Symmetry: C3
Subunit: 346 residues, 3 copies
């Protein structure tokens, strides 16, 4: 919670430590996943109508030995917020789509893995500019909508590259060009209807013949429904991506028609049994397959909260993906996983 509050500025340092264990026949994930997150969320009141804010979060891994450090900045964004107008921020922030897919991201640890960090515009990414209007400037409540842009993160500097070079370059699986997107959402009577659209130009370092799924731009459409009332949570979402969904290490997919569903219930003592189904179907991707789903699994779990600071979760990912050549080339999991976690948070 808030730790400093005086002279027109408040600042809370938040975070968590998660002692986590993965049990899987797939020895690439089996083991210990203990980690932590630490960050701050500061906000100042410039005037009775203008606000400023800065948030930052840093995830560190606690399962590595003493002689290596695994950690990364999840979010680091600064902006302003003018009342009944909206808020504008810049930095490394969440994607336009994430929010609606965040409706199906209420799992203990798994779930919402039809995308990853440093994807096109569908999760955490750098170079973001987001304008989020709340209540349509007061016409009606729970009618928010956002417009967002992102700049290019091309090839790294110093690696002999001569085209598509940016000071913060990276591997081609995580690069991107100039992209724009929007989102619209209405949440009333508990019922929530959300929609997102995004497009992003692709770089030449990604248009190579090694990575599959060549295309000019990446275009994502998402439509989702949600229901959160009387200790019940239901959510469904359907996304269609064109040249915008990763396929292991082989690159991306031409199309991807994934339909996610999740249902949870909150009991009067702190038990939350969750059931979430995910299927992401790759279609007309190429290389001889020309049709094969990227992901298919169910997740049955239970989270037990003792308060708003201490909790523990059990999770069971039943993977319904048989081992074939496409999976073995892409490196996509096919085994059932168990996740036992103990989370402290402040």
């Amino acid at each position: 919670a808030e730790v400093y509050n005086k002279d027109g500025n408040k600042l809370d340092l938040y975070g968590k430590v998660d002692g986590l264990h993965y049990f899987s026949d797939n020895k690439d994930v089996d083991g210990d996943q203990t980690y932590m997150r630490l960050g701050f969320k500061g906000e100042t009141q410039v005037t009775d109508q203008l606000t400023g804010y800065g948030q930052w979060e840093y995830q560190i891994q606690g399962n590595s030995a003493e002689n290596e450090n695994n950690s990364w900045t999840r979010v680091a964004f600064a902006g302003l917020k003018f009342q009944d107008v909206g808020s504008f921020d810049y930095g490394r922030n969440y994607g336009v789509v994430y929010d609606v897919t965040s409706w199906t991201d209420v799992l203990p640890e798994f779930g919402g893995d039809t995308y990853g960090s440093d994807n096109f515009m569908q999760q955490r990414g750098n170079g973001f500019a987001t304008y989020r209007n709340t209540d349509f400037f007061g016409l009606v409540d729970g009618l928010n909508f956002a417009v967002q842009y992102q700049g290019k993160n091309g090839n790294p500097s110093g690696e002999g590259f001569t085209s598509g070079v940016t000071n913060n370059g990276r591997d081609a699986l995580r690069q991107n060009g100039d992209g724009v997107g929007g989102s619209i959402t209405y949440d009333y009577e508990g019922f929530g209807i959300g929609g997102a659209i995004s497009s992003s130009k692709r770089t030449d370092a990604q248009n190579t013949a090694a990575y599959i799924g060549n295309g000019d731009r990446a275009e994502t459409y998402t439509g989702g429904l949600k229901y959160d009332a009387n200790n019940i949570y239901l959510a469904a979402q359907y996304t269609q991506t064109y040249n915008a969904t990763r396929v292991g290490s082989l690159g991306w997919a031409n199309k991807a028609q994934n339909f996610e569903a999740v249902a949870q219930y909150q009991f009067d003592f702190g038990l939350r049994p969750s059931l979430a189904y995910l299927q992401s179907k790759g279609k007309n991707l190429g290389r001889g397959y020309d049709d094969e789903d990227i992901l298919k699994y169910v997740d049955v779990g239970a989270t037990y909260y003792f308060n708003k600071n201490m909790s523990t979760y059990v999770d069971y990912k039943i993977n319904l993906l048989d081992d074939n050549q496409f999976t073995r080339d892409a490196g996509i999991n096919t085994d059932n996983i168990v996740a036992l976690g103990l989370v402290y948070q402040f």
Copy 2:
């Protein structure tokens, strides 16, 4: 100290900065050792009988240049604590043995180097599960005992390995298998008697012919005495490890019979002169030596506290190890060291 305390939860952010300098003829340690530690120790009261807690500490090095970062998570563990029953935690935590050897870890900077981080079960390590009972459920005070388990941390993923692979793999000198251990301690009238036992299965990546000291399991026994009264501190400890004591880079030792002693005195203004002797004898290790001690030195030092936040220490490690072929192969220090430190802590 505590910085946030309200709504049934308290959280203290603690740490220190240490401006340290090493003076040694061994140019591998001679130079600047300035560093810092930062972390949090949060605790919430679930019920009048059930507690939750989470601690985390991160050590960063301040003697490196601007273009590299040296740091690592020392401890990151979360658990619960039920009164007159005990506490159970998980994550990266301290070993079963450490506590009793912690009796001989009261030196300024040196001392307690018969083990290192990511050893078998004798210091900080990942994948820990520890149940510590206090006062034998109330029968008698100062009679605590702990039972602890640790899982395997095998070979890294993505390095072509096909056996003993875990998601948090590392080098073979720091791997381990499934291990279990216990400890029992009685501290009354200042007199403290402690004992620890630990065993750990070894992985096949460690059973190679390159690293010496092949064996099925690693077995450590420790017995120690302590005395802390009327501004006096005495401590002695004897450990015997089988296939569990590192020998530089060549692997481990078959046996190791180390006997540590330490004596310090606290004066009425803040002076603490410390004298600590360490000898760790490797026996029947192989490769032609078949008998040679791993470590032998004395440490004379003085710590001056100005308060509970600011202190400065002088330390003099007289190394009684002559330079032979075994040391030069293992990379074990043989020179006398001086350590001048200025420590601020909060």
Copy 3:
């Protein structure tokens, strides 16, 4: 600001998040420069005349992807401060010269780039020992002067080196030997006159034939003037370095006669228009050039503060360096840059 204050010790955790964007034809800097800084500045009152303090700052980069972490410790120093005597600190701290050149370091993001971190003695560096006397032990106010020493940071350990090895070695462009320096400054009636002198022995790893500018020691002289009154800021500074000014990657320069000037004005609402000119002339360096300036540019910018926590700056670096062979060998920028930043700070 201060977050913990009780029992004779105070501690403030400070920092900032900066959403920054660089626009440049030089694709090595063009892109996103969003970053953050986090640290603590603790201080305890030992006696009514003796103080202890410890500061630490850590800069992390937020423009990198999820699978790499760019960060570094900027300052980490601990010391004591006896009233009307002075303060002594050790660790990674700022250089003797920086302060006077800090008079021309009042730019939004650019400026003060005639040196870099891990230079000889003119900015942040490790192994520092600084004694700063304030008011000449009370004879006259605003007459402070400092004496500072630094030890060697030679070659890294484990890289087959046999001479000039330190436990915290680095690349030869950032090494150094035993150096000493002093500084004297008088600030009265707003008028400030500052002067600094520094000398540093050079290591053999830097005396190679690959890096240009061979010489026994590095010697820097600096003289500067400042004026800060009635919402006006003027500053000028002249440095002459011998074997102490970096030249891209080719090593250093034999001489460097740089003359920096800056002028800013603070308006009654928060606008600060800044104009800063920098020229650093390399002379008699060798390799066939024998005369060529290291840097030459102007910077026109404007910073707008909304409070002491939220601000935003625009900056325009007009580079007056034409592209020749020397620049292309050294890797020195030649293009005009634009910098748009949004800074939140606590």
